[PDB]
């Protein structure tokens, strides 16, 4: 039972994590092939989307930038500036905006002031790199801005604010591996539970052919059969199910045994010691006449047996010989 629910439950297990995959795993691939091949497509793309897409097709990027609004407040000017420069953002200010945004974002100009210098030339292919840049902090906004800026702390001053202080910028990539380990750590117990109940599933397939098929038999036909497989047995079996008749069944046994124990059970306590007479069965058969007189002879009068036999034959023959001649 219940794999379909469990598989539906298993679908819910994947549903939480893979809901992001709908947008961060499923959406990116089509735009991923639309990004590397962006330059082939940005040509016709930059004639209708910059008005329509920003309002409709690429307004969805504002939804993800919403959680980053604090930092995106400066970035918020970018959708503001693009809206007012639609004829000028199609091919021109896609590189100029970085310089414009750099002046308002000196803490983040570190990327932007470096971005404005190299973006002007290859802009029609470089704009793709810039796009990643404002996407380089989106999820990082959960982690990057506040935490990395919290470097000057006494617990992390000497160790980090001296040697690791130069890693203020490169630390961005350190986030990406952490979620991967996090999922594996999220899978430290998840896989173990997934290891066996998925395995147990094929044991719940066995209780189909063994157990649940039998309960299907139990439900209708065996339940009626219970009406049948017990009506006959009340003669011998079903009476005892209530203990009051169990003695009555024993009483019927006592009715059956009334003659047996009356006769058989009398010798029951004495038959165990009657095995001694069984040893007497052979003795009383052949050893009875031998041990009658030899009870004293074979014990202590062993040497006294030979003179008795000597007088039995050497001297008693003559008298019996007269009878033997008559008996001949």
């Amino acid at each position: 039972m219940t794999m379909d629910r469990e598989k539906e439950r298993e679908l819910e297990l994947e549903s939480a994590m893979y809901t992001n995959c709908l947008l961060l795993g499923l959406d990116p691939n089509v735009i991923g092939l639309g990004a590397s091949n962006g330059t082939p497509r940005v040509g016709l793309f930059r004639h209708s989307n910059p008005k329509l897409g920003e309002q409709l097709l690429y307004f969805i990027l504002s939804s993800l930038r919403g959680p980053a609004q604090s930092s995106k407040d400066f970035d918020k000017v970018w959708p503001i500036f693009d809206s007012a420069q639609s004829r000028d953002f199609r091919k021109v200010v896609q590189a100029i905006i970085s310089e414009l945004e750099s002046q308002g974002a000196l803490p983040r100009s570190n990327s932007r002031v470096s971005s404005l210098a190299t973006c002007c030339g290859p802009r029609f292919v470089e704009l793709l790199w810039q796009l990643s840049l404002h996407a380089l902090r989106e999820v990082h906004r959960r982690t990057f801005p506040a935490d990395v800026a919290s470097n000057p702390l006494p617990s992390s001053l000497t160790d980090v604010s001296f040697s690791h202080a130069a890693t203020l910028l490169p630390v961005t990539k350190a986030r990406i591996v952490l979620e991967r380990r996090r999922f594996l750590k999220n899978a430290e117990t998840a896989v173990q539970r997934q290891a066996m109940w998925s395995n147990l599933a094929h044991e719940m397939t066995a209780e189909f052919r063994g157990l649940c098929a039998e309960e299907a038999y139990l439900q209708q036909e065996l339940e009626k059969l219970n009406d049948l497989r017990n009506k006959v047995k009340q003669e011998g079996e079903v009476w005892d199910d209530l203990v009051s008749s169990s003695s009555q069944n024993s009483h019927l046994v006592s009715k059956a045994t009334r003659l047996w124990d009356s006769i058989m059970a009398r010798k029951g306590q004495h038959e165990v010691l009657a095995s001694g007479p069984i040893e007497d069965l052979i003795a009383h058969r052949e050893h009875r006449y031998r041990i009658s007189g030899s009870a004293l002879l074979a014990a202590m009068d062993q040497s006294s047996q030979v003179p008795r036999a000597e007088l039995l034959s050497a001297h008693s023959d003559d008298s019996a010989s007269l009878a033997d001649d008559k008996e001949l």
Partner: protein
């Protein structure tokens, strides 16, 4: 490829080796509980079923079998030896006087056996007296 393999080798300790350490105190119970309870849950239900069964089991085994097992195993014994020495001997009532006189004698035959040993003493006395004759 060595760097590729070592780079891959740092991923299992988040996933593979951790459960042999952490879930070895936190997750391995699934293997432990399920298998024994699979046997435990079945037998514990049978105990009550055995409690349901014992009333019939105390009937077929003891009241039916062990009652009648005791009865059957002695009707052959009584028909072999028990009926021989009283039931048959009624027809042999001429012999029962002698047949019952013999067990009386086997308790008293050695009493009369003094006569034969009272003759062997003559042989024994001569054997004992041999040493005196030599001396």
């Amino acid at each position: 490829s060595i760097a590729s393999d070592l780079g891959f080798a740092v991923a299992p300790p988040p996933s593979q080796e951790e459960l042999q350490s952490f879930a070895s105190s936190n997750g391995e119970r699934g293997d432990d509980l399920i298998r024994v309870l699979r046997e435990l849950s079945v037998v514990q239900r049978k105990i009550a079923d055995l409690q349901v069964e014992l009333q019939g089991r105390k009937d077929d085994k003891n009241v039916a079998h062990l009652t009648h097992v005791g009865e059957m195993q002695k009707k052959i014994e009584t028909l072999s030896r028990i009926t021989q020495i009283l039931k048959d001997v009624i027809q042999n009532k001429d012999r029962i006087i002698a047949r019952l006189q013999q067990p009386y004698s086997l308790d008293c035959i050695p009493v009369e056996a003094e006569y034969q040993k009272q003759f062997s003493e003559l042989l024994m006395k001569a054997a004992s007296d041999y040493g005196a004759l030599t001396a």
